[PDB]
Design a protein around this ligand. Structure first.
Ligand SMILES: COc1cc(-c2scnc2C)c(F)cc1[C@H](C)NC(=O)[C@@H]1C[C@@H](O)CN1C(=O)[C@@H](NC(=O)C1(F)CC1)C(C)(C)C
Ligand SMILES: COc1cc(-c2scnc2C)c(F)cc1[C@H](C)NC(=O)[C@@H]1C[C@@H](O)CN1C(=O)[C@@H](NC(=O)C1(F)CC1)C(C)(C)C
Ligand SMILES: COc1cc(-c2scnc2C)c(F)cc1[C@H](C)NC(=O)[C@@H]1C[C@@H](O)CN1C(=O)[C@@H](NC(=O)C1(F)CC1)C(C)(C)C
Ligand SMILES: COc1cc(-c2scnc2C)c(F)cc1[C@H](C)NC(=O)[C@@H]1C[C@@H](O)CN1C(=O)[C@@H](NC(=O)C1(F)CC1)C(C)(C)C
Lengths: 86, 142, 104, 143, 89, 104, 143, 86, 104, 143, 88, 104
């Protein structure tokens, strides 16, 4: 089962449902599609990568890589992460 | 409360830094005070000498970001069976995206220019509330 | 070895994983479940290069260390409308603002 | 999860029963299985041989009620500095009044006759839930 | 010392140190603010033992001394268990 | 050292502790704080024996090992009703039911 | 509509019956169905285990007369701040004199024989309309 | 300020006006004295006691006692209570 | 502490409250305001016993738990005509009917 | 910003605790990290070996309340002329009454129970802001 | 020396040296009068405040050993609330 | 040498300091400047003992280490009303509430 997350500029990101439920905010908005009128696609894409990163590396004994954040998107990513509580 | 026990029983440990951070090893003394020790460059391992029942935590040496050791917050050396040293695998935790974003922003903006950032007031206080070993110990103890 | 991918067509982006041993055809089957279009009407691309159904993802340059969860590799998708295949067009993501002064 | 390490490093221990119960010492083997050892009458002590890094807990030999050792749940022998053996002080804990009452009734009523007692039914399930080391180890492992 | 009053089902009045009675979160909550609490289903031969348990618990919690058993006569065991189950102490 | 006592009058029972060295009069002061009756108007008893204000609790037989927290010693109390002191009356606690068969 | 949420977050509560009636505690399940729980004798208090976000109401066990809890009709267990259990003070409401009179008559006359009382026909219908939890839920649910 | 309530048998009950205004029926009859030609004194006295009970115990956090009603007066009290709407 | 009273004379009944600390004379002041009769010509009674103007209602037996709102205590009232005081007369309330069969 | 200079020049110091507090000496290492040293009981003095140009501050060992050394916040050992050791006089500051009150209350109430105190809410955050060496160092760096 | 009067909530009148009271900028401002009423601060708190004035004047900028300022646990919460409101 | 004191009378409390060498009379001069009453019409006390005008505070038990700034010594004050002197009476300070539970 997949879910769709639409950015402010209309980009459609399709992610595994379980991955998106990392966000309690997104969980509440689903209870299969969600619109984010304040989060542009260059932020929402990085949010989706974080879901994959978190699901993959949580409780793993392997070496954990840094999660890269370009400085140009750092401020916008912070507010998205703050609103989504993940 | 959280403190090393004065066991006087030697225990040799391998500090393995599997993180891209410069790691600051912090030993909690018998009074529970954090005591900093020599730093470890990224990707380096060292055999050190400690004691059974001692408490250790691991931090970013430059920013004080918390790190994990054997997938948890605190490390206690145990008995060296067959003389083999205990392995302490120092890794990055999976930070929340918010804390990870706070880290990048702190590394780019001096704390003085924070209140000049265009964000909610809660984020101004979030940035200024730098990782603090004493605070984290009080949180764990609570 | 797990590989992590962004399958992109126009303004659509699918986050999925596969294995280096899995084939381009198996990747077209995953797209079929999500986007309801048969493999015959799918062409998968890496940059400008079409990918053959029989080739494994690793052979086409998708490896566990280039297609990472925190930085997935992009796979292009172009569909067929009846007769012809559309040209591969991946709409770019939005651009970030200029760095603020206190941060530059 | 909880298990003894096979250190082969000897450690001499005094098991001192400072409780009115007949104490059953339980050693956690290398597979984590509880292994019972010889019992100790109330107020008796015995010098035993164990090893560094071994895990031990202590129970009432008749009822399996949990007991304390050096005021905690688990005892691990350490290095004998200056030839002094490690001292393990087995004491009775301060049970809750409810658990203490369940003990007395369990000691007075056979399990077949529990539900023949005039009490709320909820207490029937409480009586039948006898202290169980295997259950407790799984609970601690979940923690 | 502040004391509180605990009245049994047969009207016996037991006066215990406030700090001792606050071992029980049940009793602490039942006090909040009153100084006296009536136990209409707990008879006096049970409530007296409950008060003794307060003293035993205050005295022996976190003690390295040898702790003695808390005695319960078989005649009162079922009712004490039922009171203890209802008060959850 | 510490002794643990039940001071009992009629249907009143006071649970309190004191020291073996502490005196009978100080024990009356505790009664005063609870029941607001001066020591002068109080009489303390061990069994039927009146207790002298000046004697220590240990001298009156209340020792650490007879006056235990889980098994306190009983001290009787009688007050003064105007002109005279009442006789000692300690109402007994209720009685337990007969032991059931399954527990006998 | 009126129902417990399956929070799965425990909440310990004291049910304090500060009324002369035998109280029937009623828990509204996740479907909103009333489920009766054990009764409480007059003037008794007890620690029971419920959960945050659950709904409870309280009735006379014999007549189903409605009762108040913390001066309201419904009690919802909340977070036990500072580990202290939540207090549910079950009291009589101040009934109207009419309802209180209906209660006494219902307690003295079998429903058989209501029409053998010499009263206005409207009072026959008022008496025979015994307190009903489902109707009371529907009236509250309308508000 | 008090009001007077006269029973069918001529008993005169003097109650605080605001207590008597508990009954909207009584409130309407006042707009000094009110005669109840069908309510006898052994019922109206109980009605006046109920006024006091209601005023004291409405919105009280104390334990509220039962309002006692003897069986012999229950039928007459009910009809008076139904007429007075209290 | 509030006490709740029925002040009764002949076929007159006054429902009123006062404090346990308040005095009998102050109760005559309340009766005065209602029936415009001075205390000097008023005599108050508990059953057959005359009450002294100086005594408090609590001392005269009117306590918070005997003089209840749902069950007030009765105080008798007798007035004085010119020279003498009348005897205390309290006309009884009517009698209820016999219990119906369905209620016995 | 604030860090010790690696002078490699020995300097002997007399740490003199003229306070009723158990004093914790804190040395700022070359990386500027606070590094705690052995404690000093009230009214005790100890001759220690340090180095010229090193930075030290002094705190209550139990509560981390800041203390004065030579009537200032920081101490830097200097040249031992004629073999005289350098004296570091550790004294109580004159706290504000508010900070002194916060100390007493912190010593009497576990941190978990602050919000159960009947005081203005602003004092809850005041109580929880325990003295912190790292925090105080950041403030000085802002100078 | 000029004195000032500080009146507690329960009517106790504390008379302290003007120079001593000017330790508190709050009190200095509250004087701009020779008397100030503290209707929220009881005498077992305001008495301690006056002791703090004397303690502060004596031990400010002294190299002598400074003694602890004693606070009985029973008055600690009320003293704290008084101190917070007077910011002293 | 410096002593710190609380000169107290009724609900009046004067905080002041002097020297151990200073005399009781000089302390009365300070009371006079504040309260406008001459030394002859005031009596100063240490506990229940009158203090002679000529003797020093040190001789009368007021020392730098018992009369401390953070814990001043109490000196009692009694005035003269016309003919006779009033008795010494010092109103106590308010009492603190009982320790909250979280503080015991
Ligand atoms: C500079 O050398 C080290 C460097 C490093 C690091 S860190 C990153 N890279 C390296 C190479 C290191 F990790 C440890 C050491 C030394 C050898 N190791 C300790 O300092 C242990 C650690 C703790 O367990 C405390 N400790 C004691 O020695 C304590 N002594 C004792 O407890 C007893 F003697 C039993 C009573 C004490 C003296 C501090 C009080
Ligand atoms: C029957 O005799 C005993 C009685 C008692 C008690 S208890 C209450 N009353 C008595 C009298 C007692 F406490 C210990 C012993 C024997 C002497 N002691 C052990 O059994 C120790 C204990 C644990 O530490 C495990 N253990 C091994 O010997 C293990 N062997 C080893 O680990 C090695 F050989 C180093 C590799 C193993 C053989 C079980 C695998
Ligand atoms: C017999 O024992 C009791 C007695 C009494 C009374 S009443 C008057 N005197 C006594 C002594 C009592 F008040 C509660 C209990 C039990 C312990 N307490 C519950 O039954 C709570 C109540 C409600 O909150 C519902 N409930 C669940 O346990 C529910 N379980 C859950 O919701 C979860 F497990 C989180 C998902 C469920 C099992 C009903 C589905
Ligand atoms: C445990 O023994 C001590 C105790 C105490 C105290 S404190 C309260 N009670 C006691 C008893 C004490 F005060 C000092 C010492 C030792 C003897 N003294 C130092 O540790 C000095 C202090 C600082 O100045 C730093 N330090 C270095 O030795 C540094 N080494 C150097 O700077 C060089 F070797 C020149 C390059 C370093 C090794 C830390 C990097």
């Amino acid at each position: 089962m997949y879910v769709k997350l639409i950015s402010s500029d209309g980009h459609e990101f399709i992610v595994k449902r379980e991955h998106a439920l990392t966000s309690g905010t997104i969980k509440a908005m689903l209870s299969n599609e969600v619109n984010f009128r304040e989060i542009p696609s260059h932020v929402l894409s990085k949010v989706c990568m974080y879901f994959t990163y978190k699901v993959r590396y949580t409780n793993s004994s392997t070496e954990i890589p840094e999660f890269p954040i370009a400085p140009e998107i750092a401020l916008e990513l912070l507010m998205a992460a703050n609103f989504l509580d993940c | 409360v959280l403190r090393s026990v004065n066991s006087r029983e030697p225990s040799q440990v391998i500090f393995c830094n599997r993180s891209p951070r410069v790691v600051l090893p912090v030993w909690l003394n018998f009074d529970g005070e954090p005591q900093p020790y020599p730093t470890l460059p990224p990707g380096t391992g060292r055999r050190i000498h400690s004691y059974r029942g001692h408490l250790w935590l691991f931090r970013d040496a430059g920013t004080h970001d918390g790190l994990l050791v054997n997938q948890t917050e605190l490390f206690v050396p145990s008995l060296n069976v067959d003389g083999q040293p205990i392995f302490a695998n120092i890794t990055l935790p999976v930070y929340t995206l918010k804390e990870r974003c706070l880290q990048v922003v702190r590394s780019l903006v001096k704390p003085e220019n924070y209140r000049r950032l265009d964000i909610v007031r809660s984020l101004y206080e979030d940035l200024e509330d730098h990782p603090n070993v004493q605070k984290d110990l009080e949180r764990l103890t609570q | 070895m797990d590989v992590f991918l962004m399958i992109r067509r126009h303004k659509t982006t699918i986050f999925t994983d596969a294995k280096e041993s899995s084939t381009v055809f198996e990747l077209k089957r995953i797209v079929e479940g999500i986007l309801k279009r048969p493999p015959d009407e799918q062409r998968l691309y890496k940059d400008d290069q079409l990918l053959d159904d029989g080739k494994t993802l690793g052979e086409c340059g998708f490896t566990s260390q280039t297609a990472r969860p925190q930085a997935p590799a992009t796979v292009g998708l172009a569909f067929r409308a009846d007769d012809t295949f559309e040209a591969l067009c991946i709409e770019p993501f939005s651009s970030p603002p200029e760095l603020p002064d206190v941060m530059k």
